[PDB]
Specification:
The structure is cut from a larger assembly and holds chains A (about 375 residues) and B (about 270 residues). Chain A is mainly beta. Chain A has a 4-stranded antiparallel β-sheet. Chain A has a 4-stranded antiparallel β-sheet with strand order 3-4-5-7, with no helix packed on it. Chain A has a 4-stranded antiparallel β-sheet with strand order 8-9-10-11, with no helix packed on it. Chain A has one domain. Helix content of chain A is about 5%, strand content about 40%. The longest helix of chain A is centred in the first third of the chain and has 14 residues. The longest helix of chain B is centred in the C-terminal third of the chain and has 20 residues. By secondary structure, chain B is an alpha/beta fold. Classes of the chains: A mainly beta (about 375), B alpha/beta (about 270). The interface between A and B is medium-sized, with 17 and 12 residues. The complex binds magnesium ion. Chain B: It is found in: Nucleus; Chromosome. Chain B: It comes from Homo sapiens (Human). Chain B: This is DNA excision repair protein ERCC-6.
């Protein structure tokens, strides 16, 4: 590493080299945090986490008990040991608390003054973070499994919602219009994710073992349907062209948005060319998941790319483009529901059914 | 209105005459609303269509009980036909061309007979005329001004044809759909109309026709609520119930503008 510093000082290597190499080295040295703790407030398992995209300081967490906790991750104390204190809380005494489990919570991109939370109580609530009051509510005829706002859209502010209905709802923040729907799936839509690269590209994964990419501006259904075999087993499109041999319960675009990682209940993760949906045939081995709802997993950013997938009661870290298994982060006592990656310091926060949020820091 | 100044259209008027049932027409209407069929309709036993269509026919002209100069469809037995006779006389003495619409083909035939009874040179186009001759006919009426009145059914005479040669337009019978009447009345006020046009929409006062006018005003308000503005005044003239069987003859955003819109919409 002194070689890295010397090369940076002498201009031999771009500082990009040291930055990304050290980010990768930090991610590889991920371990149970020696001096860090997260305050425990959820009475039930944490189903979702979200660190705000700008300044990466505050973290939302939705629990199976319906409460939403807002933590400050910064060590505002002077000690080397600190607990990520809870700033705010939609608790059981809040007038607008979710009646059932919160399954997805997401900070509004471009601004930390608002966030959103969807629950199995058939509601997507939009909260003002300052007053901590519901600015808007979007009711659905069937329970919400996931939702996502575009991390890129300066123009549109649509929330793509996947419920147990076979339709992907698009709730417009502007002129409150939840009527827009996308047809083409056949069972519950367990995951939805906007492309970080393209403004109007949305990937949706449903229990019909299919993943569809939509240009929501378009009037002609999905753009691409992901196919495991790319055409080896080709059939008229009524039941073929499946992404997995089970329910596809997790989506994650890579950092650049040029590839898509789909995890399904066939104990398989697959990497897809996001421009034509071709399977890249990256192996990843066997990725154990049996979750009946959406599975939240994230990818690394700003490194020389990693994907952190909940794997039983562990976090499996894989190399996205080679599939090589890095490691198992092993500190949870029950199945891990979500993991969210802090890209500023290569940190990880994992929420599981054991009512714990565990922080993994580079050693 | 946003294009009229930039298009040099002539002036328009949209008068709505409330015609008066004649003694015989009023008698037939009163006998029908006192009949047992309407009583059964109001009890839900029969469909409403028979009574509705019968009342519309009676208001158009008493062709139910076809009563020399007492032939079928004699103009003096219907008030709207009396008003039409007066209007046609006035307009003919003013050297103008008239566009006479009707919802009913039978009423169009009655109007045609009344027009031959006068010396007016007419020209008819309804659903029975061969399609191949329809555009020719229109061109004829647009070309030579010797033809005075253009008889039309609103379903064929309306709906996209150009009849700018016509100067006056008279909608003889209201329809349940406002849009039928709107397109019929815009058949004349179009690009190429070099003369001031007026629309005379005939309704029989205190009859089913006035109730239909109310229903279609309500429909037009509902349409304007989403087409031109959402501040539309509520329809208060009537409750629009099933008592139209009665005769009542007169005499990137920075999350703050977006959040403000969210706050304002919920407050509504
Ligand atoms: Mg046209």
């Amino acid at each position: 590493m002194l070689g890295f510093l010397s090369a940076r000082q002498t201009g031999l290597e771009d500082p990009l080299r040291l930055r990304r190499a050290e980010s990768t080295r930090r991610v590889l040295g991920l371990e149970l945090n020696k001096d860090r703790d997260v305050e425990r407030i959820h009475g039930g398992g944490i189903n979702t986490l979200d660190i705000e995209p700008v300044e990466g300081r505050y973290m939302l967490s939705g629990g199976s008990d319906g409460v939403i906790v807002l933590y400050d991750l910064e060590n505002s104390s002077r000690q080397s040991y600190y607990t990520c204190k809870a700033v705010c809380s939609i608790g059981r005494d809040h007038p607008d608390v979710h009646r059932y489990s919160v399954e997805t919570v997401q900070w509004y991109p471009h601004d930390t003054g608002m966030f959103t939370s969807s629950s199995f109580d058939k509601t997507l609530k939009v909260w003002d973070t300052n007053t901590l009051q519901t600015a808007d509510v979007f009711n659905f005829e069937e329970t919400v499994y996931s939702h996502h706002m575009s991390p890129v859209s300066t123009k549109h502010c649509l929330v793509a919602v996947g419920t147990r209905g076979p339709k992907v709802q698009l709730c417009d923040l502007k002129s409150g219009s939840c009527s827009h729907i996308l047809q083409g799936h056949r069972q519950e839509i367990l995951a939805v994710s906007w492309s970080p690269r393209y403004d109007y590209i949305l990937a949706t994964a449903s229990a019909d073992s299919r993943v569809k990419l939509w240009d929501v501006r378009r009037a002609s259904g999905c753009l691409i349907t992901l196919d495991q075999h790319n055409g080896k087993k080709s059939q008229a499109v009524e039941s073929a062209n499946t992404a997995h041999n089970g329910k596809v319960n997790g989506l994650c675009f890579t950092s650049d948005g040029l590839h898509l990682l789909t995890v399904g209940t066939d104990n398989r993760m697959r990497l897809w060319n996001s421009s034509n949906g071709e399977n890249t045939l990256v192996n990843y081995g066997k990725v154990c998941n049996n979750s009946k709802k959406g599975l939240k997993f994230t990818v690394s950013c700003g490194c020389s790319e990693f994907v952190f997938v909940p794997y039983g009661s562990t976090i499996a870290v894989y190399t996205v483009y080679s599939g090589e298994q890095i490691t198992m982060l092993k500190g949870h006592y029950k199945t891990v529901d979500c993991c969210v990656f802090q890209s500023n310091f290569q940190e990880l926060y994992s929420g599981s059914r054991d009512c714990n949020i565990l922080a993994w820091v580079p050693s | 209105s946003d294009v009229k100044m930039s298009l040099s259209l002539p002036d328009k008027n949209e008068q709505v005459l409330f015609c008066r049932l004649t003694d015989e027409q009023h008698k037939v209407y009163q006998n029908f609303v006192d009949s047992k069929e309407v009583y059964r309709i109001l009890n839900g036993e029969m469909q409403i269509f028979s009574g509705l269509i019968a009342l519309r026919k009676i208001c158009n002209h008493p062709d139910l009980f076809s009563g020399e100069e007492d032939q079928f469809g004699y103009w003096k037995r219907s008030g709207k036909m009396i008003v039409v006779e007066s209007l046609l006389k006035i307009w003919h003495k003013q050297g103008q061309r008239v566009l006479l619409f009707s919802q009913s083909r039978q009423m169009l035939d009655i109007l045609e007979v009344f027009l031959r009874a006068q010396k007016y040179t007419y020209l008819k186009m309804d659903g029975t005329t061969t399609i191949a001759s329809r555009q020719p006919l229109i061109t004829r009426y647009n070309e030579d001004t010797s033809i005075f009145v253009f008889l039309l059914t609103t379903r064929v005479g309306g709906l996209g044809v150009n009849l700018t040669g016509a100067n006056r337009v008279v909608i003889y019978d209201p329809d349940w759909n406002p849009s039928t009447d709107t397109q019929a009345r815009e058949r004349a006020w179009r690009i190429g109309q070099k003369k001031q046009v007026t629309v005379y929409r005939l309704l029989t006062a205190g009859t089913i026709e006035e109730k239909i006018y109310h229903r279609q005003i309500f429909k037009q308000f509902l349409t304007n609520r989403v087409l031109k503005d959402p501040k539309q005044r509520r329809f208060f003239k009537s409750n629009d119930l099933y008592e139209l069987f009665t005769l009542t003859s007169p005499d990137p955003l920075a999350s703050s503008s977006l959040l403000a819109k969210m706050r304002a919409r919920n407050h509504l």
